[PDB]
Symmetry: D2
Subunit: 39 residues, 4 copies
């Protein structure tokens, strides 16, 4: 069920860490931006 | 505050992981525009 | 669709010009990730 | 218009932004419009 290659999992975890280091206003903007990519 | 924070941040990551790979890649680049300096 | 394209492009530029400076700067950086 | 308060440097940055947008492919232009909408108050 999780077919991610190790590098992809690493980049996904780096993505979360980067998000969590954003100030709260930027985290909010990024959540809104995320939503524009949902299909 | 911690309740709604973790819910928003877990939903954010869940939605990220649900994106197709090319979208995930674009969102990583967009994240980096908030990080670079 | 040419009028529709022009309208959407002009609405985009108007909206960008109505943002505050730091947001205009952020949108420029985001555009750079698509080019 | 004649009421433009931007300095030429900002006008030039803005104009280059708009030319970069117009040079994108349609799918990307549409994605950028969606992103711009997220910055509206």
């Amino acid at each position: 069920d999780d077919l991610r290659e190790p590098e992809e999992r690493h980049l996904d975890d780096a993505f979360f860490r980067g998000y969590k280091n954003l100030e709260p206003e930027a985290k909010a903007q990024l959540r809104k931006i995320l939503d524009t990519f949902k299909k």
